[PDB]
Enzyme design. Structure first.
Site, PDB file in Angstrom:
ATOM      1  N   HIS A  65       0.823  -1.202   0.000  1.00 27.40           N
ATOM      2  CA  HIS A  65       0.000   0.000   0.000  1.00 27.40           C
ATOM      3  C   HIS A  65       0.859   1.255   0.000  1.00 27.40           C
ATOM      4  CE1 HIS A  65      -3.160  -2.863   1.687  1.00 27.40           C
ATOM      5  NE2 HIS A  65      -3.673  -2.471   0.504  1.00 27.40           N
ATOM      6  N   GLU A  68       1.705   3.730   3.143  1.00 25.10           N
ATOM      7  CA  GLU A  68       2.317   3.107   4.312  1.00 25.10           C
ATOM      8  C   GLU A  68       3.855   3.173   4.254  1.00 25.10           C
ATOM      9  OE1 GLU A  68       0.197  -0.693   4.574  1.00 25.10           O
ATOM     10  OE2 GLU A  68      -1.676   0.386   4.315  1.00 25.10           O
ATOM     11  N   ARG A 123      -3.453   4.614  -1.813  1.00 25.10           N
ATOM     12  CA  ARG A 123      -3.315   3.257  -1.296  1.00 25.10           C
ATOM     13  C   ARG A 123      -3.158   2.218  -2.408  1.00 25.10           C
ATOM     14  NH1 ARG A 123      -5.387  -0.360   2.934  1.00 25.10           N
ATOM     15  NH2 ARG A 123      -6.439  -2.192   2.090  1.00 25.10           N
ATOM     16  N   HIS A 193       2.993  -3.846   6.629  1.00 25.78           N
ATOM     17  CA  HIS A 193       2.016  -2.742   6.491  1.00 25.78           C
ATOM     18  C   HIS A 193       2.088  -1.768   7.696  1.00 25.78           C
ATOM     19  CE1 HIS A 193      -0.267  -4.700   3.210  1.00 25.78           C
ATOM     20  NE2 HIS A 193       0.468  -5.718   3.676  1.00 25.78           N
ATOM     21  N   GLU A 267       1.367  -4.895  11.136  1.00 20.45           N
ATOM     22  CA  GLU A 267       0.861  -3.544  11.112  1.00 20.45           C
ATOM     23  C   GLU A 267       1.824  -2.800  12.030  1.00 20.45           C
ATOM     24  OE1 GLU A 267      -0.930  -2.224   8.893  1.00 20.45           O
ATOM     25  OE2 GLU A 267      -2.965  -2.101   9.646  1.00 20.45           O
TER      26      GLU A 267
END
Ligand SMILES: N=C(N)Nc1ccc(Cl)c([C@@H](CS)C(=O)O)c1
Ligand SMILES: [Zn+2]
Length: 305
Positions: A65, A68, A123, A193, A267
């Site tokens: 993405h 990020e 994104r 991510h 994440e």
């Protein structure tokens, strides 16, 4: 355009970096391109490890993405860490001797360039869609894992657009292809991510749990515990569907269904104070603590070959 590990680097710089870092460490890194993006950029892949016959591998990608940025930064940090400590730190020395790290620095190159030039919050990919001006497909909704059944929009104007078909994007088709061609060596799949501070494992396309979900939960638990040791950063973990929400077509579920038993979506920082616009001042602390979890997982997988 000068490269820095404590700064977010644009694609021209990252590309020049992949070439230089490979030139400076021929005994530890080899560069390759696994495909081309919609706009013609080369999808580089770095093979990090001491060459040898039939070694297993861990696959790790960053930059799925575009917005990020901390993700892209981490792949770069990881590579320097690897070459700088090999021969001095026992664990990293042993990892590089025993396995290869397939590091994909930036998957969604086109989208990344777009965040640098027009929209910082982009994104998706940057491909055109038939019958509309709306651009892009969410790469993490474009894999053949319960493709577009949930958590994905069928409208190309939406941020989670699943695409015209599974692997419709050259990027995802190139990633799926590489993996499909190296299933025998790839033991773990790590996709990086941001943000939220979490470690997730299959499944997201369904509430059903993976065969080794208890082992995956113990692994995720141990890894976030290891990450917290450095600065106290708190991560949560669990299966995607129940921890986050059902979302079909993700690469972590797909890789798992290809037989890759250790599959995780990371994440990174933070929890929302800066969100996607994480300060460059946090790059080193983030990458360092993240290194602890990645290395923890790597050692585990190696001990379970
Ligand atoms: N197959 C999945 N949906 N995996 C998955 C798991 C956790 C998280 Cl946070 C995500 C996010 C990453 S931005 C996303 O792509 O929406 C995906
Ligand atoms: Zn993401």
């Amino acid at each position: 355009t000068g490269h820095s590990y404590e700064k977010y680097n644009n694609w021209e710089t990252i590309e020049a970096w992949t070439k230089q870092v490979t030139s400076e460490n021929p005994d530890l890194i080899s560069r390759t391109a696994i495909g081309t993006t919609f706009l013609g950029n080369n999808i580089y892949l770095l093979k990090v490890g001491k060459p040898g016959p039939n070694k297993p591998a861990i696959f790790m990608d960053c930059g799925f993405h575009a917005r990020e940025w901390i993700s892209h930064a981490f792949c770069q940090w990881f590579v320097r860490e690897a070459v700088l400590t090999y021969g001095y730190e026992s664990h990293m020395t042993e990892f590089l001797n025993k396995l290869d790290f397939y590091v994909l620095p930036v998957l969604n190159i086109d989208g990344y360039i777009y965040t640098w030039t027009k929209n910082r919050m982009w994104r998706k990919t940057r491909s055109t869609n038939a019958g509309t001006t709306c651009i892009g497909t969410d790469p993490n909704r474009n894999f053949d894992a319960g493709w577009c059944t949930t958590g994905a929009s069928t409208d190309p104007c939406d941020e989670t657009y699943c695409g015209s078909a599974a692997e419709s994007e050259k990027e995802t088709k190139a990633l799926a292809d590489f993996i499909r061609n190296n299933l025998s060596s790839i033991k773990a799949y790590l996709t990086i991510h941001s943000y939220s501070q979490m470690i997730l494992y299959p499944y997201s396309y369904d509430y059903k749990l993976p065969e080794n979900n208890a082992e995956l939960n113990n692994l995720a638990k141990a890894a976030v515990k290891e990450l917290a040791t450095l600065y106290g950063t708190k991560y949560t973990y669990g299966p995607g569907a129940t921890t986050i929400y059902p979302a079909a077509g993700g690469s972590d579920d797909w890789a798992y269904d290809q037989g890759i038993k250790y599959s995780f979506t990371f994440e990174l920082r933070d929890k929302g104070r800066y969100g996607f616009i994480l300060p460059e001042s946090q790059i080193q602390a983030t990458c360092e603590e993240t290194m602890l979890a990645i290395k923890y997982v790597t050692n585990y997988v190696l001990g379970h070959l």
